[PDB]
Amino acid sequence: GLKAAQKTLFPLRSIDDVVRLFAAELGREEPDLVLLSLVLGFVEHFLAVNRVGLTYFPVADLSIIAALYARFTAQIRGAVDLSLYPREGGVSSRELVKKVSDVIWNSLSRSYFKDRAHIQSLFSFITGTKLDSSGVAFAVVGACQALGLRDVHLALSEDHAWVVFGPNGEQTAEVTWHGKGNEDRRGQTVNAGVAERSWLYLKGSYMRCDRKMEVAFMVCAINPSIDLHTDSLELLQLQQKLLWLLYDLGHLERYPMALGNLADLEELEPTPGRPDPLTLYHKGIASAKTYYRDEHIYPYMYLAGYHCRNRNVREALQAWADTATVIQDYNYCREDEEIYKEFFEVANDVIPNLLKEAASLLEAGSQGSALQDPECFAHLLRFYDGICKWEEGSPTPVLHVGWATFLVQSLGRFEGQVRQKVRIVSPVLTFQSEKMKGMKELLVATKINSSAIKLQLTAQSQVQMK
Ligand SMILES: CC1(C)CN=C(N2CCN(c3ncnc4sc(CCF)cc34)CC2)S1
C-alpha cells in the first residue's frame, strides 16, 4: 500500500539514494516508519549479516521492498480488527494498543537470543520473526501508524521503551519486556515507575516521540557491526549521513542520545565543515537541560567517554562528577541495574586505570597533571558524593566494600598537599551526601586512613572481633 510518490526514488543503489528516500519521507506529513525501517533492515542485512556478492551497495528494488511492506501490513491488518475498538475523538484506546502489542508479541519465534545484533528492524520481524526489546515497541508504533492510529507514539527512557497514546497523548502503555528475568507489565501504565523515581522512567522526564523522532530512533538503531572486531564502513557512513539529515531538519533537537551517537561517529570519522564532537556532546547536554530538566545520565557519560579516550583526565572527571550530580536525585530501584553497572565500571575500573597512568606520567615528569590539580580531586569527590546521595532513601543499597577498596586507592593517587587544597563547605565543594560529609576529615590527612574510609563508605558497623 505505498503511495505512488514514495515509489519514485526506487531502486536505491547507494547510500545517498537511501538518504534521498529519508529526506523525501521526512518532508511528508507523516513519514512512513514501516517503509523506512524495512529499507534500513534490508540494507543492514546485506551489509552486516550477509555480504556475499556485495560489490558496492545492496540494491533495494521496489519489487523486494513492496513485497516486505505488503507482508507487514497484511499481518497487522488481518490480525487487528479495528471495528472492534471504536475510536473516540480520533484517539486510540488501551485495549486497541494492547491488541497490537499482543499481535507483534505472538508473531515472534518461541525462543531466540533476545539481544543479538540486527534484530531491531521490521526486516528482522518479517524475515526472521525476531525482535529485540525496543524493536517490539518500535514495531507496535509502526503497526499503529499503518492502521491509521496517529496518536500512538514511541516513548523512550535511557534503557527502555514503551508507547504513549490517547487523549492529548497523555496515556502510557508497556508493550515490551525490560531486561532479563523481569516479569512483564504489558498493558499497564509507567506511573508506578515514575512515582518511585527510578532511573528507568527518568522521573517522567522521558522522551515522547513525534514521528520525526521515531525516524531518528530507527537511525540510531542502525547497527553497523559485522562481528566483535569489524564494522561496516557503509553502514557507519549511512547512519552518520542520516543523523546529519535529521540534525539539519531540527529533528535531533529533543534527542540527547542521538546527538551523542552522532558525536561518537564524528570522532571516528569527521565530516568536513560540521561541528566538533565536543560541540555535539555539549548540544546533547543542553538538549537534556532544556527539554528533560537535566534528568538524563547519558549526556554527561558520552562527554566523559570522549574525554577519557583522549586522556583529558580533568575533563573526564568533571563530566563524571556531572553524571553523579544527576543520579543523586534518583532512587536506585530494581531494574536500574544497567546504570549501576556503568557507575561501577567508572569508579572501579575506568578511573583507576586513568589515575594509574597519570601517576606514571607524573613520575615521568608531567606538568599540569590531573594528580596535581585540586579541581580534579574535587571532581573525584563530587562523583562519589552523588553516588552516596543516590543511595540515600533507595530501596536497595549501592555501595559495598568492593567500592571502598578502589576509593582508597583512587584517593591515594593524590598527594596530601593537593587534597588539602580542596575547600569542603557546609576549589570549593559542598557535599550533599551524609556519607561524604562524615568523610571530610579523612580525605585531607597526609596518610589515608584506609579502614576508616571503608567504614564510612559502607557504613559497616564493626571491625574484626579477633
Ligand atoms: C554513554 C553511553 C554508555 C554510550 N552509549 C550509550 N547508548 C547507546 C545508544 N542508546 C540509545 N540511543 C538512541 N536512542 C535510544 S532509546 C534507548 C532505550 C531503549 F530503547 C536507548 C537509546 C543507549 C545509550 S550510553
How many angstroms separate the alpha carbon of residue 199 from the centre of ligand 1? 14
Cβ partners under 8 Å of residue 461, min gap 6:
none
Is the beta carbon of 160 within 6 A of some atom in ligand 1? yes
AA identity, residue 118: H
Cell of 399: 555501595
Is the beta carbon of 304 within 6 A of some atom in ligand 1? no
How many angstroms separate the alpha carbon of residue 258 from the centre of ligand 1? 8
CA distance 3 to 103: 25
Atom number in ligand 1 closest to CA 134: 20
Closest residue CA from atom 1 of ligand 1: 302
CA distance 274 to 272: 6
Closest residue CA from atom 9 of ligand 1: 257
SS3 per-residue string spanning the chain? CCCHHHHCCCCECCHHHHHHHHHHHHCCCCCCHHHHHHHHHHHHHHHHHCCCCCCCCCCECHHHHHHHHHHHHHHHHHHCCHHHCCCHHHCCCHHHHHHHHHHHHHHCCCCCCCCCCCCCCHHHHHHHCCCCHHHHHHHHHHHHHHCCCCCCEEEECCCCEEEEECHHHCEEECCCCCCCCCCCCCCCCCHHHHHCCCHHHHHHCCEECCHHHHHHHHHHCCCCECCCCCECHHHHHHHHHHHHHHHHCCCCCCCHHHHHHHHHHHHHCCCCCCCCHHHHHHHHHHHHHHHCCCCCCHHHHHHHHHHHHCCCHHHHHHHHHHHHHHHCCCCCCCCCHHHHHHHHHHHHHHHHHHHHHHHHHHHCCCCCCHHHCHHHHHHHHHHHHHHHHHHCCCCCCCCCHHHHHHHHHHHHCCCHHHHCCCEECCCEECCCCHHHHCCHHHHCCCCCCHHHHHHHHHCCCCCCCC
Domain count, the chain: 1
User: Among candidates 119, 98, 97, which has minimal Cα distance to 109?
Assistant: 119
Is the beta carbon of 220 within 6 A of some atom in ligand 1? yes
User: Among candidates 208, 234, 191, 206, which has minimal Cα distance to 14?
Assistant: 234
Give yes or no for a contact between 168 and 184, defined as CB atoms under 8 angstroms apart.
Answer: no
Method for this entry? X-ray
Give yes or no for a contact between 104 and 125, defined as CB atoms under 8 angstroms apart.
Answer: yes
Give yes or no for a contact between 239 and 224, defined as CB atoms under 8 angstroms apart.
Answer: yes
Pocket test for ligand 1, best of 206, 251, 257 (most atoms within 8 A of CB): 257
Strand ranges of the sheet holding 161-165, from the earlier edge strand across to the other edge: 171-173, 161-165, 153-156, 207-208
Pocket test for ligand 1, best of 114, 133, 158 (most atoms within 8 A of CB): 158
Closest residue CA from atom 5 of ligand 1: 302
CA distance 289 to 135: 27
Pocket test for ligand 1, best of 136, 208, 298, 306 (most atoms within 8 A of CB): 298
Give yes or no for a contact between 239 and 43, defined as CB atoms under 8 angstroms apart.
Answer: no
Beta-carbon neighbour count of residue 68 at 10 Å? Answer: 22
How many angstroms separate the alpha carbon of residue 129 from the centre of ligand 1? 24
How many angstroms separate the alpha carbon of residue 107 from the centre of ligand 1? 26
Is the beta carbon of 306 within 6 A of some atom in ligand 1? no
Alpha-carbon dihedral angle through residues 280, 284, 289, 294, given to the nearest 10 degrees:
-130
User: Among candidates 146, 128, 125, which has minimal Cα distance to 76?
Assistant: 146
How many angstroms separate the alpha carbon of residue 257 from the centre of ligand 1? 6
Is the preceding omega at residue 58 within 30 degrees of 0, hence cis? no
Give the position of cell 555539549.
Answer: 282
φ/ψ (deg, to 5) at 163: -125, 150
Beta-bridge partner residues of 153: 164
CA distance 156 to 159: 8
Cell of 281: 556532546
CA distance 163 to 165: 7
Is the beta carbon of 258 within 6 A of some atom in ligand 1? yes
AA identity, residue 360: S
Task: Give me the half-sphere count of Cα atoms (radius 13 Å) on the Cβ side of residue 384.
Answer: 30
Resolution of this entry, Å: 2.1
Give yes or no for a contact between 215 and 25, defined as CB atoms under 8 angstroms apart.
Answer: yes
**Does residue 108 come out as left (phi exceeding 0), alpha (psi in the -120 to 50 range) or beta?**
beta
Is the beta carbon of 298 within 6 A of some atom in ligand 1? yes
User: Among candidates 66, 15, 397, 63, which has minimal Cα distance to 234?
Assistant: 15
Is the beta carbon of 302 within 6 A of some atom in ligand 1? yes
Is the beta carbon of 317 within 6 A of some atom in ligand 1? no
CA distance 336 to 157: 11
Range of the domain at 364: 1-466
Closest residue CA from atom 4 of ligand 1: 302
Q: What is the CA radius of gyration of the chain?
A: 25
Alpha-carbon dihedral angle through residues 208, 211, 215, 218, given to the nearest 10 degrees:
50
